[PDB]
Design a protein around this ligand. Structure first.
Ligand SMILES: OC[C@H]1O[C@@H](O)[C@H](O)[C@@H](O)[C@H]1O
Length: 344
């Protein structure tokens, strides 16, 4: 597994002279990863099957404009705080803060103009690229100036994403990457034939608005028990589930820990995920309605892709029994997620 080489090129130009967007291509002998400076968006991810055939296993667009249209956060970095915040409101050190209600009745994925929709500054690395941006105080209702660095590196079939941040004032922070995967290749219609395993003992049941109830429910005897590989379609069926969109609680320390494994027997592709995060959002692309103009004439229907957003638990800022989500001045936010690609 070789260390990747990096190439860059102009990808697009933002309207209203918002700036030039570049595309960085990371390539090793095993994988090819494409990333743009707009929202640190992974745009393509090429991985081999058992025949040695490479398919891009990530949903996305061929042109910038694709991302600028109303699309569900494809392959981007999410923040300041990923997922939902009840009532778009939280308090920090006795001060109450209000955010944009971009998802009645809550606030979701950073607001109206979240981290996925801003231009990051890129710095090419020997085997990858680093994006950096300053989220000023008050950005999207959040207190504190947040300095963030998103670093993607590639070595063999392992893609590594690290998140670093520094706040000038206490603020919640929860960064992740919303890539939609499809191991049978981007163009397959569904993920039913995927085999999933999530090393989680508990999960977070949610409410009518999808905010966690506050309960840390055990997965035992439930359809949420993914500790043993299950075929997605069968499972959903056997359990009468429409799909998933839940945070699974990881057996967390801040140490690199196994998160989940996804296998696609027909191609033999395997995706293994490790993280330092306390949880993972496992969302089976339930909201795709097959109206998006994807890559290679691909349209993305419901269930065409799934996400594995490693993160801290949703609404943590309002749920004291949840892992701490506040970043205070002087400390450092630092989380890493490993996307290990392989063949079985
Ligand atoms: O379509 C974007 C999706 O992003 C997920 O992280 C979230 O939990 C889903 O409910 C939905 O908002």
């Amino acid at each position: 597994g070789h260390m990747a080489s990096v190439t860059r090129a102009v990808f697009g130009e933002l309207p209203s002279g918002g700036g030039t967007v570049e595309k960085f291509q990371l390539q090793s002998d095993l994988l090819r990863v494409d990333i743009i400076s707009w929202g640190c968006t992974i745009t393509a991810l090429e991985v081999k099957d058992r025949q040695g055939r490479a398919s891009d296993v990530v949903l996305g667009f061929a042109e910038l404009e694709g991302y600028l249209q109303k699309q569900p956060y494809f392959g981007a970095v999410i923040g300041r705080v990923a997922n939902r915040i009840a009532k778009g409101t939280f308090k920090v050190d006795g001060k109450e803060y209000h955010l944009a209600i971009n998802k009645e009745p809550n606030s979701l994925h950073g607001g109206v103009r979240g981290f996925d929709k801003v231009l990051w500054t890129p710095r090419v690395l020997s085997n990858g690229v680093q994006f950096s941006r300053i989220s000023p105080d008050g950005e999207e209702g959040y207190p504190g100036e947040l300095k963030v660095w998103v670093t993607y590196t590639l070595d063999g079939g392992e893609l590594i994403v690290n998140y670093r941040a520094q706040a000038s004032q206490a603020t919640p922070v929860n960064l992740t990457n919303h890539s939609y995967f499809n191991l049978a290749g981007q163009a397959s219609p569904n993920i039913n034939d995927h085999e999933v395993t999530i090393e989680a003992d508990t999960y977070l049941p949610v409410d009518e608005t999808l905010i966690p109830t506050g309960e840390v429910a055990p997965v035992q005897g439930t359809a949420f028990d993914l500790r043993k590989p299950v075929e997605l379609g069968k499972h959903l069926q056997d359990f009468h589930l429409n799909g998933f969109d839940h945070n699974f609680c990881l057996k967390g320390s801040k140490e690199k820990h196994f998160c989940a494994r996804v296998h696609h027997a027909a191609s033999g592709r395997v995706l293994e995920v490790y993280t330092t995060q306390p949880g993972v959002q496992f969302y089976t692309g339930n909201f795709l309605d097959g109206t998006l103009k994807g890559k290679n004439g691909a349209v993305y229907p419901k269930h065409s892709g799934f996400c594995l957003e490693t993160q801290n638990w949703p609404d943590a800022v309002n749920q004291p029994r949840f892992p701490p989500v506040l970043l205070r001045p002087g400390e450092e936010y630092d989380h890493t997620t490993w996307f290990k690609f392989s063949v079985a």
